[PDB]
Chain A
């Protein structure tokens, strides 16, 4: 019923700016506060702040009062978070989440936007295959994160192990996905949809 759609994976440049969009659907977007949380990779949850789409009222954590500007468009039912002066500590996942008539707890959560701030260039994955028996896909040389892997357009779920990617010394990323018993690799930041 209630769905929060978030903007797709972005590559940001250091010291520049990025704008994140949270499209609400399934409720009166104008009567409930929206909240934003940041999670640095492998770290805990950070409360950024909250906007009240009707009033337009905002509350902020001090730390982010310089980094993040919360806005909302009632006509579109989209909340916006704007990130400025992008350091490396802004490389994180940002979540929007519906609250109540006061901010309160976040009961419905958006999927999250992965923001990588970097000078390097986007590069699409090369998907190399691999041979109960184990078969697999190698997703080599891609940037930024993340890549999604599915097997048989989602038919194959059991026995799948998609691994945490590794940062090859070049600064490009690699991961392998295997299943024991054709694989669909997606890389939004380079709009790649290889299905080996």
Chain B
């Protein structure tokens, strides 16, 4: 049974840097190997086939190399559209197995959140529910803190939050927090912005 070690499981890099993902096999697989790219909540798409052959529509910065037990997907000139997970797959002999996956992310300059706040809409209030929403739009360092303070009281155990994946057009993140004032703490602002 062929086993597949793919390394690394995460990578960060700046636009234009070159990036390499390695797949390692327990046996020789004689270049019966595919690479796939998976963008967030989409189907895998074939990138490289038979170890070295690029697929149709795949840009020139993708390359594949490898011999018997060691195969590599290289991205010279890393682009923000390349954000996602990358998998290898051998087809040397049934059963077919995949790789663990590499999550590609982009290093960029620090970007401060834009903060907006939303009042529980009337319709929700009519239904005996009150959700208040805080949105941080497009910050780069993903590390963020939203603190909730209604009646200037630090609320706790009553908020739920959600981040997106890096935006390919900005390399930034977005964040949404629900309470059923917000104090935003991030390393691109000085004093924690507070909207209420």
Q: Is A26 engaged at the interface, CB distance under 8 Å to the other chain?
A: no
B89 — which chain A residues lie within 8 A by C-beta?
45, 47, 105-106
Stretch at the interface among A11-19, A67-75, A117-125, A129-137: A129-137
Number of A-B contacts (CB under 8 A): 125
Q: Mark A109-148, 1 if CB is under 8 A from B, else 0.
A: 1111000000000000010111101101010100000000
| Residues B176 and A163 in contact, CB atoms below 8 Å apart | yes
| Residues B43 and A180 in contact, CB atoms below 8 Å apart | no
CB within 8 Å of B: which A33-55 residues: 35, 37, 44-47, 49-50
| Residues A105 and B164 in contact, CB atoms below 8 Å apart | no
Known: A103-B91, A163-B164. A136 touches B118 (CB 8 A): yes
Closest to A102 in B: B91
| Residues A95 and B137 in contact, CB atoms below 8 Å apart | no
Closest to A64 in B: B95
| Residues A180 and B137 in contact, CB atoms below 8 Å apart | yes
Interface residue total, chain A, C-beta cutoff 8 A: 45
A168 — which chain B residues lie within 8 A by C-beta?
160, 180
Q: Is A178 engaged at the interface, CB distance under 8 Å to the other chain?
A: yes
Q: Is A104 engaged at the interface, CB distance under 8 Å to the other chain?
A: yes
Known: A45-B101, A47-B97, A164-B162. A105 touches B176 (CB 8 A): no
A112 — which chain B residues lie within 8 A by C-beta?
43
| Residues A166 and B98 in contact, CB atoms below 8 Å apart | no
Best-buried of B95, B97, B160 by chain A (most CB within 10 Å): B95
| Residues A105 and B100 in contact, CB atoms below 8 Å apart | no
Assembled-state Cα–Cα distance A140/B167 (Å) = 24
| Residues A103 and B94 in contact, CB atoms below 8 Å apart | yes
Closest to B46 in A: A107
| Residues B133 and A138 in contact, CB atoms below 8 Å apart | yes
Q: How far is the CB of A185 from chain B (nearest CB, A)?
A: 14
| Residues B96 and A174 in contact, CB atoms below 8 Å apart | no
A interface secondary structure, majority: strand
Q: Which of A131, A161, A166, A174 contacts B137 (CB 8 A)?
A: A161
CB within 8 Å of A: which B97-135 residues: 97-101, 114, 116, 118-119, 121, 123-124, 127, 129, 131, 133, 135
| Residues A176 and B95 in contact, CB atoms below 8 Å apart | no
| Residues B131 and A138 in contact, CB atoms below 8 Å apart | yes
B160 — which chain A residues lie within 8 A by C-beta?
166, 168, 174
Q: Is A28 engaged at the interface, CB distance under 8 Å to the other chain?
A: no
A129 — which chain B residues lie within 8 A by C-beta?
121
| Residues B91 and A105 in contact, CB atoms below 8 Å apart | yes
| Residues A178 and B44 in contact, CB atoms below 8 Å apart | no
| Residues A106 and B34 in contact, CB atoms below 8 Å apart | yes
| Residues A140 and B131 in contact, CB atoms below 8 Å apart | yes
CB within 8 Å of A: which B44-86 residues: 44-46, 49-50, 55, 85
Q: Is A149 engaged at the interface, CB distance under 8 Å to the other chain?
A: no
Assembled-state Cα–Cα distance A50/B93 (Å) = 13
Q: 7 smallest A-B Cβ distances: which pairs?
A: A105-B34, A109-B43, A134-B116, A45-B98, A161-B174, A163-B162, A130-B118
B residues whose Cβ falls under 8 Å from a Cβ of A: 32, 34, 36, 43-46, 49-50, 55, 85, 87, 89, 91, 94-101, 114, 116, 118-119, 121, 123-124, 127, 129, 131, 133, 135, 137, 160-164, 167, 174, 176, 178, 180
| 13 further interface pairs, Cβ-Cβ under 8 Å (given A47-B98, A163-B174) | A37-B98, A45-B101, A102-B91, A104-B91, A106-B34, A106-B36, A134-B137, A138-B124, A161-B137, A161-B167, A168-B160, A168-B180, A176-B133
